[PDB]
Amino acid sequence: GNEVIFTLWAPYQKSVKLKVLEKGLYEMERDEKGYFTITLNNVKVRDRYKYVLDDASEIPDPASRYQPEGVHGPSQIIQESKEFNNETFLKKEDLIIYEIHVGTFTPEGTFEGVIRKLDYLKDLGITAIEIMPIAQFPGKRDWGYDGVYLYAVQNSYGGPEGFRKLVDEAHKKGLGVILDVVYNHVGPEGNYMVKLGPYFSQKYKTPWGLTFNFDDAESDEVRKFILENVEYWIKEYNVDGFRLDAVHAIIDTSPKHILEEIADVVHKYNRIVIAESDLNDPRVVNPKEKCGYNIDAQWVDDFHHSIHAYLTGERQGYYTDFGNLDDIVKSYKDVFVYDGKYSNFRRKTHGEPVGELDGCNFVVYIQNHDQVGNRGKGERIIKLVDRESYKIAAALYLLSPYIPMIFMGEEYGEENPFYFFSDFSDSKLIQGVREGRKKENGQDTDPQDESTFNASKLSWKIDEEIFSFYKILIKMRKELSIACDRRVNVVNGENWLIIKGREYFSLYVFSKSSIEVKYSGTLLLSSNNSFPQHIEEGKYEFDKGFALYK
C-alpha cells in the first residue's frame, strides 16, 4: 500500500507529536532507547511536516530528505525508489577527479548547470566529478560545510530531483560522481538536534562547531544516523563514492572506529571512499589486517604545499613547514613530507611513514576549494606564479603516481578568485564569521555580501594554450600508465628536476640551467617550443619550462 513510517530519535523529549501541515497532529509512540514512531496511512509525496516538542515548539525532521523553505522551514516527503547498480564502473586506478562547487560552477548555479557542462568535462578526460557538500545549509550561498540536514539535498541547487538527474546523466556519459560529506561537525544555524538528544560530543569539539558523539553515552543511535546517511546516498542517489570532510576531526575511542565502519558500508555496496586527513597517518588508508580503516585514498596536502611554497616563495601559516625543492622530491617519493619529523607550524612531531602503499591510496592537487578559498584574497595559484611555473605545477601533479584532482576552472586558466562566502540569517553568526574571516584569513571582502559569491563564479573565459595543455597532460597520464606506480626515479639540481617512470621521463626546469640527462626519448608534450623533438643522453642548457618524453 501507500502508508509510511515516521521515525524520530529524541531521548531528551518526554512526548513528541507529528504535524502534517494540511492534516492533523498525531501522537507518537515512545520506546526504551528514546525513539518516537508512528505509521500513517494517509501520507503522500509530497506533504510537508514538522515535529512538535514538549516545548510545544516546532522543528524540522533532522533526518529530512528535502527542506523546500530552507533550514528553518518545514520538511517535505520525497519519492523513495531505491534504484542503484550494485557496482560502480569507476576503477580507482583510472581516477581523475574534478572538484565542483554547484553554486559557482555555472551562471545557473544549479545541478542543471553542471549537467550542461558534462560533455566538456568528459572531453577533457576527467573520469569523476567531486561535488562539494549538498546537505541543506542556510540560504543559498555557502561552500556546503555549514550544511545542517545530512539527508536533504540543497533546495536552491535544484533539490533531490536535480541531484538525482545529475548522477543519472553523469553515468550516461561515462562519468562518476563523488559526494563530499561532512560527519565531523554540523552547521551553526538551523541545527535542531541539540534539543532532541546527545547527538553532539560533550568531550571536545571542532573549529567549525559542535562535533558528533560516537564513543560516549547514547552514541549507538548517532552512529546509526551517520552510517545510514552513507547508505542513503548510495541507495537513493546511486552515487559512486564519497569524499569525507576532515576525518582528523572525527574522534572515536570505540573498539571499532567509525571511519572503519563508514568504509565497511561503502565497500559493502562496492563504492569508493576518499578521506581528507590532516593526520599524515597511513592508518586511515591501510588495510584492516594492517590496522587501518581501509579508506580507499586520502588527500595529501604535503604534495600541494611542497609545490606551492616552492613556486610562490610564500611561508605564511602552514607553508612555513615547506619551501624547498627537496620537499617536492620527498613528497614525490615518500608521499608525506612530514612522516614523523618535527613541524614548526604544529610545534610537534607529525606523521608516520607510508610504507609500500601504492600511489592510488592518495589524491593530490595544486588547487582546491581550501587552498584557494582559505586565502584572504582567495587568489587562485595562477595569480601567484608565472605562466611557466603554472604549467610546471600542473605537470607535476597530473603526472604523479597519485590520484590527481583538478579544481573547477584550473584547467582553462581561470583567473577569478574563489572567496569564502556564507548566507546565514542569524545576525550573531553573521557578526562572528565576518570578524572570524577577517582575523584568521585576512579576508577584506564581506562573506555575507552577495558580490563576494558572484565574484567567485567561474568566468569560463577559456585560455586555449593552457586548456590544450591540461587535455594532453591527462591523455598522456593514461597512455603512459603513470597511475599508482610509485617506482619513479627522481634527480634534482639546484633549480631543476627530472622524474623518470617506467615509460616516461619529465624535465622540470624552474630556472635556466645546465642539466645532465641520462635518458633517450621522443617529446610528448612541452610548456615551450624550446625542447627537442628527440633527445639523447647528454648535457643540455634549458630555459625555464617543462617537457615530457616517451
Q: Residues 6 or more apart from 431 whose CB is under 8 A from it?
A: none
Q: What CATH number did the domain enclosing 542 receive?
A: 2.60.40.1180
539 and 521 part of one domain: yes
CATH number of the domain where residue 96 is located: 3.20.20.80
> Using an 8 Å Cβ cutoff, are 94 and 472 in contact?
no
**Same domain? 416 vs 497:** no
> Does the residue 371 lie in any domain?
yes
Same domain, 281 and 409: yes
The dihedrals phi and psi of 522, each to the nearest 5 degrees, come to: -105, 135
Residue 67: left (phi > 0), alpha (psi -120 to 50), or beta? beta
CB-based contacts of 68, cutoff 8 Å, min separation 6: 48, 74, 76, 155, 159
Grid cell for residue 509: 626546469
- Residues 367 and 499 occupy one common structural domain: no
Is 342 in the same domain as 253?
A: yes
How far does the chain reach from its first CA to its final CA, in angstroms?
Answer: 64
Q: Name the binding residues for substrate.
A: 243-248, 301-305, 369-374
| Residue that terminates a domain, selected from 34, 61, 80 | 80
> How would you class 451 by CB atoms within 10 Å of its CB: exposed for 0-12, middle for 13-18, buried for 19 or more?
exposed
Name 382's Cβ contacts closer than 8 Å, sequence gap at least 6: 390, 410, 413, 414, 415
Resolution in angstroms comes to 2.7
User: Are 474 and 360 contained in the same domain?
Assistant: yes
How many residues are there in the chain? 550
Which of 22, 46, 80 represents a domain boundary (last residue)?
80
Verify that 136 and 247 share a domain, yes or no: yes
Active site residues: 245, 276
Element (H, E) at 454: helix 450-454
The parent domain of residue 75 ranges over 1-80
Say whether the peptide bond before residue 30 is cis (omega within 30 degrees of 0): no
Query: Residue 341, Cβ neighbours under 10 Å: how many?
Result: 11
**Domain CATH number, residue 34:** 2.60.40.10
CA-closest candidate to residue 327, choices 347, 348, 341, 346: 341
CB 527 within 8 A of CB 469: yes
Specify binding-site residues: 243-248, 301-305, 369-374
| Count of C-beta atoms within a 10 Å radius of residue 125 | 20
Q: Which residues of 230-260 are buried (b: 16+ CB within 10 A; e: fewer)?
A: bebbbbbbbbbbbbbbbbebbbbeeeebbbb
Asked if residue 306 and residue 162 are part of one domain, the reply reads: yes
Backbone phi, psi, residue 193, to 5° = -65, -30
Q: With respect to residue 397, please indicate whether it lies within any of the assigned structural domains.
A: yes
**Is 435 contained in some domain?**
no
Tell me if residue 540 falls in helix, strand or coil. Answer: strand
Rounded to 5°, angle at Cα 280 from 323 and 399: 60
Q: Is residue 168 part of a domain?
A: yes
Q: Are residues 195 and 291 located together in one domain of the fold? A: yes
With H, G, I as helix, E, B as strand and everything else as coil, classify residue 92.
helix
Tell me if 203 is assigned to some domain: yes
C-alpha cell at 87: 557496482
156 lies in a domain?
A: yes
Do the domain assignments include residue 548?
Answer: yes
481 contacts 503 by C-beta, under 8 angstroms: yes
CA atoms of 418 and 83, how far apart (whole Å): 36
Q: How many CA atoms lie within 13 A of 432 on its CB side?
A: 10
Amino acid identity of 348?
K
Residue-by-residue DSSP string for 13-62: -S--EEEESSS-EEEPEE-TTSEEEEEESS--TT-EEEEE-TT--EE--T
- What is the DSSP pairing of strand 521-526 with strand 513-517? unpaired
Element (H, E) at 396: helix 387-398
Q: Is 470 found in the same domain as 337?
A: yes
Residue 277 CB coordination number (10 Å): 24
Give 246-276 as a 3 state SS string: CHHHCCCCCCCCHHHHHHHHHHHCCCEEEEC
Cell 550542461 sits at which residue? 116
How many domains does the chain contain in total?
3
Same domain assignment for residues 9 and 144:
no
Rounded to 5°, the CA angle 386-445-320 comes to 50
Experimentally, the structure was elucidated by X-ray
Question: Do residues 480 and 519 both lie within one domain?
Answer: no
Domain end marker among 465, 485, 505: 485
Pairing of strands 176-181, 241-244: parallel
Helices 387-398 and 464-480 pack at an angle, to 10 degrees, of 20
| Other CB atoms within 10 A of residue 537 CB | 10
Note whether residue 539 is domain-resident.
yes
